[PDB]
Amino acid sequence: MNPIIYTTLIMTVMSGTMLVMISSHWLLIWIGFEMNLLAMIPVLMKNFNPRATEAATKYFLTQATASMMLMMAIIINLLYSGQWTITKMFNPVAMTMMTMALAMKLGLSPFHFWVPEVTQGISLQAGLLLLTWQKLAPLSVLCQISQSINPNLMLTMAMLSILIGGWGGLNQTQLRKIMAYSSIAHMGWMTAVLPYNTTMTILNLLIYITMTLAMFMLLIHSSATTTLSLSHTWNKMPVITSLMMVTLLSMGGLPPLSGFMPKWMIIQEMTKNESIIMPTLMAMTALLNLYFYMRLAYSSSLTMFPSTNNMKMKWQFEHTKQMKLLPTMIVLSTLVLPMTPALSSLN
Amino acid sequence: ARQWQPDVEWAEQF
Amino acid sequence: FYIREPPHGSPDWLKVGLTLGTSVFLWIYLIKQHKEDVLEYKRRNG
Amino acid sequence: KSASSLLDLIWLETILPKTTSFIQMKMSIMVSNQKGLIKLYFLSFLITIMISMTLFN
Amino acid sequence: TMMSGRPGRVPLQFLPNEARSLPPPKLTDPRLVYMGFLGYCSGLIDNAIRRRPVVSAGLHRQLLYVTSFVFFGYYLLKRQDYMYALRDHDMFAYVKSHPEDFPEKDKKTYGEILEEFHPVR
Amino acid sequence: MPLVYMNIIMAFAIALAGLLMYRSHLMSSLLCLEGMMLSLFIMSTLIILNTHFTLANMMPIILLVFAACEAALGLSLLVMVSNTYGTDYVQNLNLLQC
Amino acid sequence: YGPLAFVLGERTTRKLTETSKVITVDGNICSGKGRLAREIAEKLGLRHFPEAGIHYADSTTGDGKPLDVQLSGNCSLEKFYDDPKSNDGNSYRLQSWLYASRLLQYADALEHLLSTGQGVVLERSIYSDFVFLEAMYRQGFIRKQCVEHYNEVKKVTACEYLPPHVVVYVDVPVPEIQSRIQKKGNPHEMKITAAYLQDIENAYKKTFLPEMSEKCEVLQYSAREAEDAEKVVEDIEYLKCDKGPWPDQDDRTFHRLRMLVQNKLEVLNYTTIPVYLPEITIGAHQSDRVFQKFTELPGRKYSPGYNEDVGDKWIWLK
Amino acid sequence: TMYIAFILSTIFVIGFVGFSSKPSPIYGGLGLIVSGGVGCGIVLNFGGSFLGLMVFLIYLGGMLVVFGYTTAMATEMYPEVWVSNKTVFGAFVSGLMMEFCMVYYALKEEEVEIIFKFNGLGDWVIYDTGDSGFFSEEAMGIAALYSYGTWLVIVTGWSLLIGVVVIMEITRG
Amino acid sequence: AKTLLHKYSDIPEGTECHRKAYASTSIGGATGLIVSAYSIALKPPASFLEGVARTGRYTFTSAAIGAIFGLTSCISAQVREKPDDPLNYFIGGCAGGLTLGARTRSYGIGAAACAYMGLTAALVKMGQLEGWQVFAEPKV
Amino acid sequence: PFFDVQKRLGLDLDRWMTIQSAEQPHKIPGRCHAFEKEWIECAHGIGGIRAE
Amino acid sequence: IRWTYARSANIYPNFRPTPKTSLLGALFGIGPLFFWYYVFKTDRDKKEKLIQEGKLDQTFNISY
Amino acid sequence: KDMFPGPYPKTPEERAAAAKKYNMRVEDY
Amino acid sequence: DGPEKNYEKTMAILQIEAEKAELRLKELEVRRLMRARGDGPWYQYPTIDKALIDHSPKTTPDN
């Protein structure tokens, strides 16, 4: 792919997301979603492999179904209200259909099945975009219609997402699949507080985006896609695997790391609304995510695995590609807990 | 005497 | 020492000067902004 | 026998740590069926849509 | 969504003009110092990743890290203080304008109130 | 609502069920996608015409444009699968699991 | 060089000219291919890369001086000559290290060709390195699993590189090679058997040369024929340029290749594939100790240019 | 003839069942052809001459390229019809039975609530009694795309160009 | 959904044990049908008869669990004359877990299911008595 | 995150087709122009919670 | 080494929850707990009853 | 790894291997 | 220092913390009432702007 063409496709994805987050008309939100899908498919297939084609096809099918359901919901809302503005949806059936469509776009379980497959099929560069940038538009739409969202359906989807993400992450040895299941769990965490307080959803989204950017950029800097391949990184570059262990501990939600901020604030907001069983269950189920993160930390840094002889040649050379945002993303994802009262700026 | 330091048998589990 | 000259080598005085100028400009702008904010806060209250 | 093995190294562990971890492992195996066929989870999507429409109206 | 729909809120404005009536955060603020500390840690990690002397290499780069972090932290803290002041102001105004919902309670001293004694035997 | 609205909504539901229930070919799934798009076009067009929402009469055309854009996307993905596997059978998409 | 340079207008097809070709002079052990390669490089004007040894990577990185065997290679050709069936896996470890060295060499050669434009004359290549491995397996020095690992590593790295335009092969027979070796002087080379050289020749003439002829032209010369550099040069100057996939290359694939060959760690990414063969699997304690020893070498601790011990200065502003 | 729209909508549902049962894509093509033509008829009956003719024209052209591919990619030595596989025939019969049951329930029982509330009266009732004058209101609203909908034009054009680019990038190997 | 929930809850504790058991059986059967549908979708049976058998087994297991839970809870409430004690629901849940173990023919499964189910049913009874909200309406 | 750039910059990208009571070509009124006008003018500025 | 391993690390892997093992574990784990709970609860109830009716003497119990 | 205590021996081969491991006689073990 | 310094510091700290607790309870009640009624500056979900309505002579006289 020509670099100019790749830049145009990336800018088209970003422009689709900005159209979704900027318009006041439902038709333009659907248009932005369509542009996002159109410009995302070739970005998924930048490196041509049968696995890449399979991932692109599955993603296209899922997003197409979700967009069709979303447009049907929009049309029904127009029929029962004569309105196109992004506001309190005036039909419960349309609200349910739109919720299902947006959950399918986000990958909330039981619409989670495509995420581990599409994430594994595509490269790390495309996986980062899929797991970070592709969550902005549906979350923004959900935040704009949080008033009309049926709390029961959203809470059930969030709890199922957390449970399924934790369970799926335990049986995975491919790093991309582990990241996909962690993303599913974190999306459930974000959508748990949508009916209660959207600013907490925004905070969780920002923290998750920083953590996933750090993790994916570390994986790219190590060129590792499996636990065994990542294990060798302790020999060539111990700093990368140590930072990866710290970021995994942060993702587990362990204080004083930044990953404690979203869970803590979410539990606070959900207890303010007299919901005590759901946040407790979510906190207890986060232990599975913490488990597979810890297992990875063992295989990567906490314990040293056997390397190969050819790493001696690799010792001499230094990395050429330089990701300028990696140190900032690592710092913001590990040492920002003393800065929670900054929550107000998101209001 | 030394730390256990995973061998190939342990590493092939992952 | 090195057979191939280091990719960094002698300092990129252009980049170093740009970084130093940006940092100094940021500090000066921050100080001026703080002074203006203090003056405005005193003016609006007394 | 009655304390050192029976309670500590066996039942206490069987009651809480071992049982939970086993249940989590079985659930992990179930969720990650390692099939990867659209024909299956799209039917699951259809079932989910129907169930959501029935329950939440 | 609370503060999103406040009347008179100008979209995509980081600091409203009414925020200037509040005292700016002091340049010796502990939060600002922590922002500078985060910038310094970012510089150290940048040195560590690129395999150069962590505490000495690239003083200009670490200085830029610290300056940018302090600058953005100062503006962020100013916005946070403004938002909390807005929250308190709105809460006070709502309490004042709704006396029935927040009535003063009869002040009974402990000599009057009867709280049951639970012995510890 | 009029019975025509019921029929069109039922057609959309049937097309959605068809798309969600694959059998062998990926071409038929794209057919169900296009059918859903057509049903949505008819629904929106009837709604706009009935309520005399003049300025909204351009909405179905935009919907159709993005519909055939998605159709072209699907067709291109179909050719790549056929080139990579020889058939458009949905069972060949099996490398990516879980 | 990067995506920005390609966008701005820097295209490699402009740099390619009549003599922008990669030439690999192949041959059996001590076939005199080195002199032929040097003479080709001198007259055609191309750059000559001496065959990659154990310490080739040491030449490109750092001071250009070989490092210790414990650090750079952990293998010995002399030990392989003495004991080819050692239980230390020195044979296959040496073969894999030599394949990695030649992979780096090919990358450097392609880089030089795609950047400067000058042609390259290499001695053998990653495409010809499998001959030694097959000979070792046939002799029984290495087992089948080592061959499987070598094939797995090769099929992931060689595919991303263009085969040489010209394959010049010297065809000195086995008995003459034996005579040269027994007159060369090196006792370790004298320890080489006959079946090893015979299997090397068999592999060269059965798999490499036919497969290379399938892709491009394959010039062949005997001992007498290879001694006329002018004759060999004239053949290269009149070869049909249609041979090889290089004419099927545009600036897109050239940009991809130039991006790949400039990142050495990306070049050697799949060399260290986590296949735990006992012959190459270095233990955790040994890996830690050897890596610590490497990190303590002068100039090998920090990135190039930031090592104050080796005279690098201005590090505070660098 | 007072229920022409209802008959056309029933044929619409029939065609949707026809191409939803997944016969050979060739036969799904004519199923979609019938559905599109009947939908054009409905839109014409509701006053949308341009819109109905537009769906008719576009889908007619689109299904042609699908047919080209059905003979290139989805070509089975024995292409299957609605009466060739018990699965396809079962889906077709189930769809027809569902449509017939809902039609009967809607007709004989005036007010029907399956998911929404549908009224059994003819579609002619909902029509308005206004006069558009010397106008084709649908045509004027559609033509307002170039005057009012400049943003829509820009976004749609950009999406079409990016679609061409995406097709070329996907189908390049 | 809520129709069955109110068909079960509106029946007072320790009254009309047959109808309470029937309502619990209906709830269990609905849950088992949902589980069977999901299992068929995700793990396809080889034959239609195999799918019918799988659905029947799952539905019968779930319905038996629900019926046993309802009967045990109502009988405990009747005999002990304590309608508002979570121990009744604990006994019902343990009985349901024992029936689950019997259907799966495993003593360990039976014991674990008895324990967890009894705890969950006691928690449900406590939430009903106190007013715990699994899905709390947004109030802030 | 509804980044209302339209209200900030003053641009009108899609607010012209949000309602049928807005300006339409040749002043063709909507079928329910009066009802929508009444509903919008009633529920202007009082917030969604009160408007419901 | 084998003796140490068998005493500590090889117990659970070779453990099977037979009815004998389960019943012994129950009667040795929760048995004494319930016994002591009964004894202490009865003693505390007796003490509280005596305090309530005022039939227990605590003349110099000013440290507890 | 084979010189550590293992599961209960079932086959006579396992009973001989365990006896050899514990430096005993098969009959005595 | 003197025993009175800690005394006065404790009094100040108790005053501040009690004010914080009272303000937190007040904020919770205020937020609940504003969400329930929507008659305050918070939870003001947007509605259609009435400046979009076209108050011009249409085509049909009955508007």
TrEMBL record, chain G:
A single GO cellular-component term from the record reads:
mitochondrial matrix
Which positions in this protein are listed as binding ADP? 30, 33, 81, 95, 102, 124, 129, 132, 184, 189
Q: Which GO terms describe its biological process?
A: mitochondrial electron transport, NADH to ubiquinone
Q: Which residues bind GTP 1?
A: 30-34, 81, 95, 102, 124, 129, 132, 136, 189
Residues binding GTP 3: 30-34, 81, 95, 102, 124, 129, 132, 189
Q: Which cysteines are joined by disulfide bonds?
A: 216-241
**Sequence positions that bind GTP 4:** 30-34, 81, 95, 102, 124, 132, 184
Q: Which cofactor does it need?
A: FAD
List, for all copies, the residue spans of the domain called Deoxynucleoside kinase. 23-236
User: Which parts of the sequence bind Mg(2+) 1?
Assistant: 28, 30
Could you list this entry's UniProt keywords, alphabetically sorted: Electron transport, FAD, Flavoprotein, GTP-binding, Metal-binding, Mitochondrion, Nucleotide-binding, Phosphoprotein, Respiratory chain, Transit peptide, Transport, Ubiquinone
Q: One Pfam family of this protein, by short name?
A: dNK
Q: Which residues bind Mg(2+) 3?
A: 51
Q: Binding positions for GTP 2?
A: 30-34, 81, 95, 102, 124, 132
Record text on subunit structure and interactions: Complex I is composed of 45 different subunits. This a component of the hydrophobic protein fraction.
Q: Which family does it belong to?
A: Belongs to the complex I NDUFA10 subunit family.
Q: What does this protein do?
A: Accessory subunit of the mitochondrial membrane respiratory chain NADH dehydrogenase (Complex I), that is believed not to be involved in catalysis. Complex I functions in the transfer of electrons from NADH to the respiratory chain. The immediate electron acceptor for the enzyme is believed to be ubiquinone.
Name by which UniProt lists this protein:
NADH dehydrogenase [ubiquinone] 1 alpha subcomplex subunit 10, mitochondrial
| Species for this entry | Sus scrofa (Pig)
UniProtKB/TrEMBL annotation, chain K:
* Keyword list, A-Z: Electron transport, Membrane, Mitochondrion, Mitochondrion inner membrane, Respiratory chain, Transmembrane, Transmembrane helix, Transport
Reading the lineage from the top rank, the first entry is: Eukaryota
Which region is the signal sequence?
none
Please indicate if the UniProt record lists Electron transport as a keyword.
yes
Q: Quick one: where is this thing mainly located?
A: mitochondrion
- Any one annotated GO CC term: respiratory chain complex I
Does the record's keyword annotation contain Transmembrane helix?
yes
Compartments in which it is found: Mitochondrion inner membrane
Q: What exactly does this protein do?
A: Accessory subunit of the mitochondrial membrane respiratory chain NADH dehydrogenase (Complex I), that is believed not to be involved in catalysis. Complex I functions in the transfer of electrons from NADH to the respiratory chain. The immediate electron acceptor for the enzyme is believed to be ubiquinone.
The UniProt entry's sequence similarity note says: Belongs to the complex I NDUFB4 subunit family.
Subunit structure, as described in the record: Complex I is composed of 45 different subunits.
Name of this chain's protein = NADH dehydrogenase [ubiquinone] 1 beta subcomplex subunit 4
Species for this entry = Sus scrofa
Question: What does the record give as the organism's lineage?
Answer: Eukaryota, Metazoa, Chordata, Craniata, Vertebrata
Encoded by which gene? NDUFB4
Q: Which residues of the whole protein does the chain here span?
A: 66 to 129 of 129
UniProtKB/TrEMBL annotation, chain L:
Family as reported in the entry's similarity comment: Belongs to the complex I NDUFB8 subunit family.
**Superkingdom of origin:** Eukaryota
- Section of the entire sequence shown: 34 to 62 of 186
Q: How does it assemble?
A: Complex I is composed of 45 different subunits.
This protein's name: NADH dehydrogenase [ubiquinone] 1 beta subcomplex subunit 8, mitochondrial
Function summary: Accessory subunit of the mitochondrial membrane respiratory chain NADH dehydrogenase (Complex I), that is believed not to be involved in catalysis. Complex I functions in the transfer of electrons from NADH to the respiratory chain. The immediate electron acceptor for the enzyme is believed to be ubiquinone.
- Kindly list the places in or outside the cell where this protein is found, as annotated in its UniProt entry: Mitochondrion inner membrane
Underlying gene: NDUFB8
Automatic annotation (TrEMBL), chain M:
Q: Which domain of life is it from?
A: Eukaryota
Which sequence ranges form a coiled-coil region, renumbered to this chain?
4-36
* Subcellular compartments: Mitochondrion inner membrane
Functionally, this protein is described as follows: Accessory subunit of the mitochondrial membrane respiratory chain NADH dehydrogenase (Complex I), that is believed not to be involved in catalysis. Complex I functions in the transfer of electrons from NADH to the respiratory chain. The immediate electron acceptor for the enzyme is believed to be ubiquinone.
What protein family is recorded?
Belongs to the complex I NDUFB5 subunit family.
Subunit comment: Complex I is composed of 45 different subunits.
Know the name of this protein?
Answer: NADH dehydrogenase [ubiquinone] 1 beta subcomplex subunit 5, mitochondrial
Organism, as annotated:
Sus scrofa (Pig)
Tell me what gene encodes this.
Answer: NDUFB5
Full protein stretch here? 127 to 189 of 189
